[PDB]
Amino acid sequence: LPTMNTPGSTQFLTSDDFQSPCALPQFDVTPSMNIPGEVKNLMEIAEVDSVVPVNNVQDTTDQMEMFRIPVTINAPLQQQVFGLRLQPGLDSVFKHTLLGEILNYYAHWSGSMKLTFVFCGSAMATGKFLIAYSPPGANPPKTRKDAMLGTHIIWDIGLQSSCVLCVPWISQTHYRLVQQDEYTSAGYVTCWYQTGMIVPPGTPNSSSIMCFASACNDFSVRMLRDTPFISQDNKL
């Protein structure tokens, strides 16, 4: 049967799908067992919440302190609680979270995100907070009046101790680069005092808040790549 070899023959492509001979002919495999916890897609992992280390103050002698956002009883009428860049795969805040780790194995991402805040103060304490997301622009907000123009939610602390801020997917392109640059910016997220925290007598004067990050049901990734967080110099 006449034949002609085309270019690419005898090459080894690491991502090919070809049949090959079996070295252990007629090997009987062990019967399957339905172990609990089967995972069929990394996105299922990506959708689980994880604590975000927002308090990266360059002076954290205690590592666990990075997870707590300080709050005080007597604050200037309007005062910023925190601010951060929305770069889930590049910013130091999201770099090592359960979501950031998955993204670092890819190059493109798209979809919305969830940020959940939980108040871990006393039961008698109360307050209100304004959390706003500012799409990309030439300047990040500096005061509450600037922040309130963008997407935001007013959070009231009560019996329900958690509030969810859904960051919508507002972008000019269907996808964004994990190694984000100026062209594919995503904006900023900030939190401000809405009313202030009030406490009765006989309670601590300070409290803390924690943030959780996760992906919505429309999130996706593409173009698999090798992560840069792990490296070696010599064979183990």
Which stretches of the chain bind a copy of itself, using CB under 8 A? 1-10, 12-13, 15-18, 20-25, 27-28, 30-31, 174-175, 220, 222-223
Residues 6+ apart with CB under 8 A from 45: 39, 98, 102
d(CA 225, CA 103): 10
Question: If you ran DSSP here, which 8-state letter would residue 75 be given?
Answer: -
* Site membership for another protein, residue 194 (CB under 8 A): no
Element holding 213 (H helix, E strand):
strand 206-215
Compose the 108-147 pattern: x for residues touching another protein by CB under 8 A, - for all others: x-xxx-x-x-xxxxxxxx--------xxxxxxxx----x-
Question: In whole angstroms, how close is the CB of 196 to a copy of itself at the nearest point?
Answer: 47
Question: In whole angstroms, how close is the CB of 143 to another protein at the nearest point?
Answer: 10
**Residue 88 and residue 100 in contact, taking contact as beta carbons nearer than 8 Å:** yes
Q: Residue 15 or 139: which CB sits closer to a copy of itself?
A: 15
Cross-sheet strand order for the sheet of 128-134: 80-85, 188-193, 128-134, 151-156
Of the residues 75, 78, 83, 195, which one makes contact with another protein according to CB under 8 A: 83
* Site membership for another protein, residue 75 (CB under 8 A): no
d(CA 45, CA 43): 5
- In the list another protein, a copy of itself, none, the entry touching 139 (Cβ below 5 to 8 angstroms by class) is another protein
d(CA 233, CA 210): 37
Number of Cβ within 10 Å of residue 161's Cβ equals 12
Question: In whole angstroms, how close is the CB of 79 to another protein at the nearest point?
Answer: 10
Question: In whole angstroms, how close is the CB of 36 to another protein at the nearest point?
Answer: 4
Question: In whole angstroms, how close is the CB of 98 to a copy of itself at the nearest point?
Answer: 23
* Site membership for another protein, residue 73 (CB under 8 A): no
Name the token pair of 3: 């034949």
Interface positions, 195-234, toward another protein (CB under 8 A)? 202-204, 206-208, 210, 212, 214, 216-228, 230-233
Residue whose entry in the numeric block shows the structure tokens 């406490």 = 199
* Site membership for another protein, residue 76 (CB under 8 A): no
Question: In whole angstroms, how close is the CB of 216 to another protein at the nearest point?
Answer: 6
Question: If you ran DSSP here, which 8-state letter would residue 218 be given?
Answer: T
- In the list a copy of itself, another protein, none, the entry touching 77 (Cβ below 5 to 8 angstroms by class) is none
**3-class state of residue 65 by DSSP:** helix
Name the token pair of 174: 């269907």
Q: Which sign does the torsion angle of CA 8, 11, 15, 20 carry?
A: positive
Compose the 15-54 pattern: x for residues touching another protein by CB under 8 A, - for all others: x-xxxxxxxxxxxxxxxxx-xxxxxxxxxxx-xxxxxxxx
Q: By CB under 8 A, how many residues form the interface with another protein?
A: 162
